[PDB]
Write a protein that binds this DNA or RNA. Structure first.
Ligand SMILES: [Mg+2]
Ligand SMILES: [Mg+2]
Ligand SMILES: [Mg+2]
Ligand SMILES: [Mg+2]
Ligand SMILES: [Mg+2]
Ligand SMILES: [Mg+2]
Ligand SMILES: [Mg+2]
Ligand SMILES: [Mg+2]
Ligand SMILES: [Zn+2]
Lengths: 100, 82, 145, 143, 53, 117, 141
RNA sequence: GAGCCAGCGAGUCUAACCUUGGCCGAGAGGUCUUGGUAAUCUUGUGAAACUCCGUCGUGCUGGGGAUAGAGCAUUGUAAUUAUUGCUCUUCAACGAGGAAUUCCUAGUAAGCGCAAGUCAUCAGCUUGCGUUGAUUACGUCCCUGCCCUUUGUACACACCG
């Protein structure tokens, strides 16, 4: 059946227990699964000057944004696939399913 | 147009450009008694160019006048046959 | 390996294109003394003349250097690809030239005279002696004259 | 023991295989050779004018032997250097595209390299049969 | 007349503006957010950009 | 001789075409007519034909006022006087045949040269 | 199966993974022999681990080193650390611990970075200068 | 001419961004397809310094490439006070820099490139990242600043009192 859950949040601790609750609820339903592949975290960096005007000492400033992205691959008949994704949706954590 | 340097020239000796009979046996007769042979010594004692020095150095090493130590580029180091 | 006795025909000076070309250097770098020929072009002519480029300028045969100068003064007729020439697709004649020695200086003055004669912007900038390629002049070239 | 192209120094194997090219005389050299300078960043044409297609061909032959597949865009990056931009700082500039594409076409004619699936040029079994044989030949020279 | 607002605005500093304060200078176009540099610095914390190092 | 613009002489070029003149044009001028079919030449050229008829011979025509200084001097406009805008004034220039393949801008200077004194 | 261990040497960014198994004694670096490592001076630098312990401990094992990252001279140091650690790992698993300690001591006496990776890392660049310490120029008038 | 190795990163859909590969062209470029909304494709970003062989041979020289002249392309509604790129030619000052003065204590200084930002086009700039990697010191208040203590004061918008 080959469905795949992908998680792409920025909050790591929300993301993990989402991912843990996928894999643990899998194991009551006893499904074979590729355990979470953790892709390299990608840092979005924006380096701006502090001052609004152009006076003073040239102090710069780097704002960054870390994005964490995991995927879990599952094979399951339809009733578990309807059950797993319907629950365990946590705010700020993005979930999307692809099949095959 | 003041310059705040002095800028003297030099003497600019005229080192030989093509090789002829007077240079040819002169290198033939006195590359022995040279303990160390290289391009720059040949420039200073024989007044030939680096061109001639590099080509003559290649010439002697097959036929037999000078023994090599090191055949790296830009630096040739040669000893005498005693 | 190859040591060679040079002989009494040798020349410390030679004259091609009305310029006193010095001897005692390689032929391609020696002919760059002649205006209108630079290192690239000089290599191609001596290549197209089938001369040994390793030779010095003062020892080359009399027929070879006159063969060389013909290829310089009629370049594209002897299979030079003619985007290689300096004054190609000329403004009156339409045909690809290659000015040599005095032509380079004389023809450079002439096309200046057109821009001065039509009062084109670049010509008026040359008449004042200022820059013509759009440079800043507020600081640089300050003591030009 | 099964000596190969990897078992011999890069310089002398390329020099030996290029000399095999000069004697064989079958390369289909382009015709603009000794007019081109083979890189847009270069300042002169190759000083060793009477060869250097044979040098380049031997150089490119070893590269497909090492790698899986190359194109012509890769070879321009490999053979490019720093272009002295006058009074500005230097920059990497690619090599002349025609030179790589033609010698890759020329090596197709002698049968060394072939086209590949997934794009690019692959060493054929004829290429993988004679490059070893010069490698055997060139490595007993000092022995 | 049709001649009003007819000059192209497809590229250049005249095509883009800060989505908050409609300014042209100091725009930040990385990652497609298009906020001026002084307005992003006021909004960086609640967008999700933070200072760490 | 009289002026032959890149080997093509006056007896053809004064009226041969605008479009084959660009065949003998340098890169920039060939690129300009490669792209762009606006009616800004159109309106200018029609007023150029008007000014030519109202002049007889031994009259230079009336100076035609334009703003656009990026219009290439085509051989159709040879023999006229054009008032080119340089930002606050219209400068008087006669179109020679030898100023071919240039813009009008090169002949109406936009600044007044400095003297320092 | 076949007695085999797997080690790695490192340098600034270069890492070289080495598969040490039981064999006839050939020591290859990226499919090429150890005698072919291009920078001619430092080739004599990569001989020195086997030159320290004697070539006799390399008769019955054969070595493959795969090299990635870093630069030219960084790649050389990662190679030598990988083969030195790989040899000392092989004698740890299969041969007794006596052979390990004489192997380790001769390495660690000659040069300590044959077994321990150098801990010197790059220092981040700071705004206001081209480097990490340097500043651009101060002018007062 | 040959070898030949990084890391930080960016990239298009209701748009046309990063571009592999084939072909044409000396080049810059053109054209036909493809992969990529990305640890998947560009991309091992085959970077430069560097390394090995060769020509040069102390000559303002094959150092340096300013300033000029012709063409070919690319971005763009438009490039003339040359946008930028490429070819050929022209090939200047400069032979280590006075008084002055800046930055720096180890993967640091310095050399060398690359990505990103601005960006339709344009980097000799900046923010970062790697590559190659020293000498010297491990002190002191001499200079210049700043801080503190003692002291005098008729000052306290405080010595520009
Ligand atoms: Mg200020
Ligand atoms: Mg293969
Ligand atoms: Mg890169
Ligand atoms: Mg000039
Ligand atoms: Mg001082
Ligand atoms: Mg630097
Ligand atoms: Mg008192
Ligand atoms: Mg008081
Ligand atoms: Zn704003």
């Amino acid at each position: 059946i080959k469905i795949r859950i992908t998680l792409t949040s920025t909050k790591v601790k929300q993301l993990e227990n989402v991912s843990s609750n996928i894999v643990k609820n899998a194991e009551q339903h006893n499904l074979v699964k590729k355990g979470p592949v953790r892709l390299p975290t990608k840092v979005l960096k924006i380096s701006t000057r502090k001052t609004p005007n152009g006076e003073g000492s040239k102090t710069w400033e780097t704002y960054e944004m870390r994005i964490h992205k995991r995927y879990i691959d599952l094979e399951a008949p339809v009733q578990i696939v309807k059950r797993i994704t319907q629950i365990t949706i946590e705010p700020g954590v993005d979930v999307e399913v692809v099949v095959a | 147009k003041k310059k705040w340097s002095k800028k003297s020239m030099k003497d600019r000796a005229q080192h030989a450009v093509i090789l002829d009979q007077e240079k040819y046996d002169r290198i033939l007769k006195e590359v022995p008694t040279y303990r160390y042979v290289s391009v720059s010594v040949l420039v200073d004692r024989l007044k030939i160019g680096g061109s001639l020095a590099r080509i003559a150095l290649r010439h002697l090493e097959k036929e037999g006048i000078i023994k090599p130590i090191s055949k790296h580029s830009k630096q040739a180091i040669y000893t005498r046959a005693t | 390996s190859l040591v060679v006795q040079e002989q009494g025909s040798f020349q410390h000076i030679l004259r091609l294109l009305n310029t006193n070309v010095d001897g005692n250097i390689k032929i391609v770098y020696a002919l760059t003394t002649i205006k209108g020929v630079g290192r690239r072009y000089s290599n191609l002519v001596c290549k197209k003349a089938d001369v040994d480029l390793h030779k010095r300028a003062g020892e080359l045969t009399q027929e070879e250097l006159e063969r060389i100068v013909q290829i310089m003064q009629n370049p594209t007729h002897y299979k030079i690809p003619a985007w290689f020439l300096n004054r190609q697709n000329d403004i009156t004649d339409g045909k690809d030239y290659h000015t040599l020695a005095n032509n380079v200086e004389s023809k450079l003055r002439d096309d200046l005279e057109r821009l001065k004669k039509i009062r084109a912007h670049r010509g008026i900038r040359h008449f004042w002696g200022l820059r013509v390629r759009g440079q800043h002049t507020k600081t640089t070239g300050r003591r030009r004259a | 023991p099964g000596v190969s192209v990897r078992d011999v120094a890069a310089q002398d194997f390329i020099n030996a295989y290029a000399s095999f090219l000069q004697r064989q005389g079958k390369l289909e050299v382009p015709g603009y050779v000794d007019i081109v300078k083979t890189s847009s960043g270069n300042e002169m044409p190759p000083q060793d004018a009477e060869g250097w297609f044979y040098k380049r061909a031997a150089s490119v032959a070893r590269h497909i032997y090492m790698r899986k597949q190359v194109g012509v865009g890769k070879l321009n990056k490999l053979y490019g250097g720093a272009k002295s931009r006058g009074v500005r700082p230097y920059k990497h500039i690619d090599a002349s595209g025609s030179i790589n594409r033609k010698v890759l076409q020329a090596l197709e004619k002698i049968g060394i390299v072939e086209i590949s699936p997934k794009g690019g040029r692959r060493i054929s079994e004829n290429g993988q049969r004679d490059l070893d044989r010069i490698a055997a030949q060139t490595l007993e020279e000092d022995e | 007349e049709n001649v009003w607002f007819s000059h192209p605005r497809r590229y250049g500093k005249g095509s883009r503006q800060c989505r908050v304060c409609s300014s042209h200078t100091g725009l930040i176009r990385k990652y497609g957010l298009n906020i001026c540099r002084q307005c992003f610095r006021e909004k960086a914390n609640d967008i999700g950009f933070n200072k760490f190092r | 001789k009289t002026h032959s613009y890149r080997g093509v002489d006056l007896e053809k070029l004064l009226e041969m075409s605008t479009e084959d003149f660009v065949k003998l044009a340098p890169a920039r001028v060939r690129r300009r007519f490669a792209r762009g079919m606006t009616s800004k030449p159109a309106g200018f050229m029609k007023k150029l034909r008007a000014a030519k008829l109202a002049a007889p011979e031994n009259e230079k025509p009336a100076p035609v006022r334009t703003h656009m200084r990026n219009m290439i001097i085509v051989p159709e406009m040879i023999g006229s006087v054009v008032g080119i805008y340089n930002g606050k004034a219209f400068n008087q220039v006669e179109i020679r045949p030898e100023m071919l393949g240039h813009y009008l801008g090169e002949f109406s200077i936009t600044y007044t040269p400095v003297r320092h004194g | 199966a076949v007695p085999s261990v797997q080690t790695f040497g490192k340098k600034k960014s270069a890492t070289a993974v080495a598969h040490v198994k039981a064999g006839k004694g050939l020591i290859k670096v990226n499919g090429s022999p150890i005698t072919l490592v291009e920078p001619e001076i430092l080739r004599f630098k990569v001989y020195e681990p086997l030159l320290l312990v004697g070539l006799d401990k390399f008769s019955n094992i054969d070595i493959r080193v795969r090299v990635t990252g870093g630069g030219h001279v960084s790649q050389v140091y990662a190679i030598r650390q990988a083969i030195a650690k790989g040899l000392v790992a092989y004698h740890q698993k299969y041969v007794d611990e006596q052979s390990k300690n004489e192997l380790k001591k001769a390495f660690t006496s000659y040069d300590r970075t044959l077994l321990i990776a150098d801990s010197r890392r790059p220092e981040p660049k700071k705004f206001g200068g081209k480097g990490a310490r340097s500043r651009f120029q101060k002018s007062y008038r």
